[PDB]
Amino acid sequence: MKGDKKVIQHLNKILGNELIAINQYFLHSRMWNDWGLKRLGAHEYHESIDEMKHADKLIERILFLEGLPNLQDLGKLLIGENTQEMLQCDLNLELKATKDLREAIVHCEQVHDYVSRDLLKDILESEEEHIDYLETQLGLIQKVGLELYLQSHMHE
Amino acid sequence: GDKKVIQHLNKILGNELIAINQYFLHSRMWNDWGLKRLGAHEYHESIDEMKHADKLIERILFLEGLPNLQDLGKLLIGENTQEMLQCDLNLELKATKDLREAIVHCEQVHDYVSRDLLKDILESEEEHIDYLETQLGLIQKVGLELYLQSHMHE
Amino acid sequence: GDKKVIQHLNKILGNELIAINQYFLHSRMWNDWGLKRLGAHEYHESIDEMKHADKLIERILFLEGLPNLQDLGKLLIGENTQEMLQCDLNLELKATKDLREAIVHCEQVHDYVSRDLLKDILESEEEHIDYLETQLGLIQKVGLELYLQSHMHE
Amino acid sequence: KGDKKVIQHLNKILGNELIAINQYFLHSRMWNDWGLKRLGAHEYHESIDEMKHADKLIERILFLEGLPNLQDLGKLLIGENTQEMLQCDLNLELKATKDLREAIVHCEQVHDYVSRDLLKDILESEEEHIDYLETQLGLIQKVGLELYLQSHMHE
Amino acid sequence: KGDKKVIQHLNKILGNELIAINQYFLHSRMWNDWGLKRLGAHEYHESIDEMKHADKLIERILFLEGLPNLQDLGKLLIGENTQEMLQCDLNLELKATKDLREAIVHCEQVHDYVSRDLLKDILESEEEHIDYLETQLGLIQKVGLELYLQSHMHE
Amino acid sequence: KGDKKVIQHLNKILGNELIAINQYFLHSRMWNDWGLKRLGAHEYHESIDEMKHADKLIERILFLEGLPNLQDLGKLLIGENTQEMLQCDLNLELKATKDLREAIVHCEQVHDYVSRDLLKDILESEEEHIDYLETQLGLIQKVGLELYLQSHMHE
Amino acid sequence: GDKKVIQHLNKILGNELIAINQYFLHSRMWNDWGLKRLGAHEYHESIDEMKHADKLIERILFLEGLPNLQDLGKLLIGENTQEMLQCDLNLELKATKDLREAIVHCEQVHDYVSRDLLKDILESEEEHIDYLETQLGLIQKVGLELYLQSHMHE
Ligand code: HEM
Ligand code: HEM
Ligand code: HEM
Ligand SMILES: [Fe+2]
Ligand SMILES: [Fe+2]
Ligand SMILES: [Fe+2]
Ligand SMILES: [Fe+2]
Ligand SMILES: [Fe+2]
Ligand SMILES: [Fe+2]
Ligand SMILES: [Fe+2]
Ligand SMILES: [Fe+2]
Ligand SMILES: [Fe+2]
Ligand SMILES: [Fe+2]
Ligand SMILES: [Fe+2]
Ligand SMILES: [Fe+2]
Ligand SMILES: [Fe+2]
Ligand SMILES: [Fe+2]
């Protein structure tokens, strides 16, 4: 059973996005920890872990479909230099990720690879949860102010 | 923090980032082939490199450096079990060479805490070399097929 | 219920009924030969198809159709381990082709609950394909006798 | 018998520990008196950490047949508000790590590797303390003094 | 805000505690170094007792709006052997109880009854230490030094 | 793979461990035979400690593709009474640590930092053993031989 | 204590001291090679000989002799698994010959407690011989590579 060439290419594209997010969120997590914003650092670590698990599932699916997972190409990390920029960078990355996920799902439907579609939909649900988290945090910065938002995320 | 020590630390970090991906892919390849014992052990090697990367990142930030997670070097991906193990060994031998050079520099500028971190990583890499050389020796002693059979089931 | 959806569900059900019997017989043949790990695994494949058949029967009755448990198609029975595994693989590949055609039809008439049921079965069949292709690949990598030895004891 | 200059170095490190014990203990109780109990508890634990380092150095000096010096207490850097107290602690820690590096150099030179390893363990702990202090000073810059204090009022 | 002379007295008692902490800690580690572990353990516990007294005095001084003095460390009385060490501790304790009685008199004079009660609790503890020390010196006389040391080798 | 002279050093340290295993095991069983059971038990644990060191050295030598030498057994220093046995153990330990320091120098020179760390760990344990031995000899001087023996008759 | 009995006991002790070191090194060789089941079993054989040595030392001291731990005879170190097992067997057969001669002498001078100790040691050596002859028999019956495969994993 060789999967569809274009589906495998789509899955490798989603994998590439996951690989960017893993590193981006891990660095942001450790930056927040370095700054003593430990609640932010812990949450961002868990975001990184979630992307690691997505990457794993994509790697497994690609190999089952007799494709070659691409872990060599690492795209541009969007690294902020303060809390507001870092969150916005994560949100920008997530919005790119979901655009790619939708185009991949379209392709899966068109060639009847419904299992790959379901996997991508599961990932998409998790990325929209991440967008929900990010948009809410940026909203909280507007509502309570940056300094109070940072204070709320100093201690776990 | 010393700028050349931070360069070294970022170099070691770069080596960890390659190993993470190389071992993770090799792990999932072995799993796809039904060599589940190899796949599980290789996954655990990958996790070990993730932990090393984490400590390096934390140290670089403490020393007010910028950790480099952007530049991913060349993955050494084998096409069968014998090549995969040799690729891992080739990577590890390069990693320990770089570790030794980084330790020298830490000693020279009296960064004894960075040296101790790198020595802990180096002991872990030498355990990995021990594992890899042992597996390649077993392939010579029992043959490839028996070695694979012995790593089919967990 | 849509008439052509019910026909598709009854076709998938027919595929499950073939699979139940083929896998159950293959299981008991392996147990008779003393290849108990294969017999146990094949027994669980048969049970999985039984559960799919149950879910299809229940769906057909909900949609006010008549489940067809009377028509049993051709069992693909092998005479040795390699043929049996390939017979199972050939049956699964036909099964996945019918499931995709049934899903296309469910989407067309907006029977999204039937589509979801068929998608869940499809994921289970692709896991069975993954298992079967892996086993055939292991036979190539370690040879038939070692593969059989590996599946003698549970 | 130990190397005489190694024992001198160990007694110098011990002297730094003795300053830090008292400085941190007083800062802790000042923060407790002011009702900044989270700062007070954390600083108490810094003081205890230095007490344990002092103990290990005393034991090592005695094993090497030296005389531990608990008599000469150097200058305590006592701040008058939270920002100064943290800065005082950081100033003390930086002097402490400099002395530790010079002691390790000397241990290495005379092949006293066990003393080196003891001082390296202490150095790891002092750098963790520097990490804590630099982080707190950075937090004061990022959220402001009053929020930083409020966050350290209750345990 | 407390009486200026009461605060001075409390700082004087605190100064005696800080000498005692360091003298007893060193003596404890000297006895451990010699393999007289029962003496070492007991002397360690005496040192901890003084640390806890010092803490209470610091807290009381800060409450009374005084400045605790952890900077001034008086003369440690370090012995060269078990008998001298025990006598050194006893000499220090007798000086300490003298200063405590004078501080209590002053607390009474100015109606600082809470500071008085704190100092009386500390004094009770010091007289228990004196009881311990005088009893050990008497055991050395009754069984001999070598038997006394043997009895305190193993915990 | 491993440095030829590093392997030589490791085999030298291993040789010293092999002497110590047998010397301490025999001293233990002599003390047991004499009814000095506390001495015999402690000396047994010293022997066990040396066995674990030898094991680690053997494993490291094999990893580095050297040939561990368990064939060459140097001179056991067997005493005739408790004081001589302790001094024989101390003489052996002091030769052991001298060799360990020379091996660490050589590991450092050729960047075998993992072998250095292993040898430093062994060195720390030998210095603990020296601490024990020097303390026992000091106790014999402080309380006398007969009381020292009495204290080590019963576990 | 009979002077000739003590000489015999010191001879047995000397055999134990060779065996401790030979089995301990063979154990760590097998571990280095990744034959962990062999390595663990050989470790336990080494420990068994340590315990025999201890009992002999205690008996000698009770009989007012001097235990000789200074003279270490020739270790028979093999270069591969079959050689190592044959080296162990050669040592054991020699050990049992000396044990039988020591027992003869104990019986002759009526040292029945020493005899009973040596008989206990001898029963253990004959069990070791049973193990070694069996392993060499297995190498003949299934072949070296399968024998090795069977002792890779604990
Ligand atoms: C910058 C690169 C990475 C870093 C720093 C990193 C770090 C970590 C850390 C610290 C853990 C927790 C390990 C533990 O303590 O148990 C972890 C877990 C894990 N990592 Fe990574 N990782 C990285 C990249 C990756 C990649 C590229 C993959 C896969 C393609 C991956 C897959 C996983 C998986 C599957 C887990 C277990 C998660 C779970 O089941 O909870 N990681 N990683
Ligand atoms: C101003 C001087 C000091 C004060 C106020 C002080 C206070 C304290 C306090 C409150 C404790 C906790 C005791 C307990 O609750 O059991 C303690 C423990 C301890 N102290 Fe001090 N101390 C001082 C100086 C020292 C010095 C100079 C040393 C050694 C050279 C030392 C060694 C120790 C040790 C080893 C502990 C036990 C820590 C543990 O294992 O948890 N202290 N001290
Ligand atoms: C190359 C020489 C030797 C090596 C590497 C060695 C190694 C070891 C090791 C690793 C252990 C287990 C220790 C633990 O983990 O607690 C042990 C136990 C022991 N050793 Fe040795 N050993 C050696 C020689 C000897 C000798 C020469 C004797 C006595 C004459 C001896 C007597 C014992 C005894 C009685 C035990 C405890 C066994 C038990 O009760 O299970 N060993 N040895
Ligand atoms: Fe994701
Ligand atoms: Fe597409
Ligand atoms: Fe799904
Ligand atoms: Fe995400
Ligand atoms: Fe939050
Ligand atoms: Fe690593
Ligand atoms: Fe360099
Ligand atoms: Fe460390
Ligand atoms: Fe590694
Ligand atoms: Fe099915
Ligand atoms: Fe249709
Ligand atoms: Fe569903
Ligand atoms: Fe199926
Ligand atoms: Fe299997």
Ligand SMILES: [Fe+2]
């Ligand atoms: Fe098993």
Ligand SMILES: [Fe+2]
């Ligand atoms: Fe310290």
Ligand SMILES: [Fe+2]
């Ligand atoms: Fe110096």
Ligand SMILES: [Fe+2]
């Ligand atoms: Fe250490």
Ligand SMILES: [Fe+2]
């Ligand atoms: Fe500190």
Ligand SMILES: [Fe+2]
């Ligand atoms: Fe905090």
Ligand SMILES: [Fe+2]
């Ligand atoms: Fe007191």
Ligand SMILES: [Fe+2]
């Ligand atoms: Fe007064």
Ligand SMILES: [Fe+2]
């Ligand atoms: Fe009271």
Ligand SMILES: [Fe+2]
């Ligand atoms: Fe007292």
Ligand SMILES: [Fe+2]
């Ligand atoms: Fe007593």
Ligand SMILES: [Fe+2]
């Ligand atoms: Fe003792």
Ligand SMILES: [Fe+2]
């Ligand atoms: Fe040793």
Ligand SMILES: [Fe+2]
């Ligand atoms: Fe050398």
Ligand SMILES: [Fe+2]
């Ligand atoms: Fe280590």
Ligand SMILES: [Fe+2]
């Ligand atoms: Fe030792």
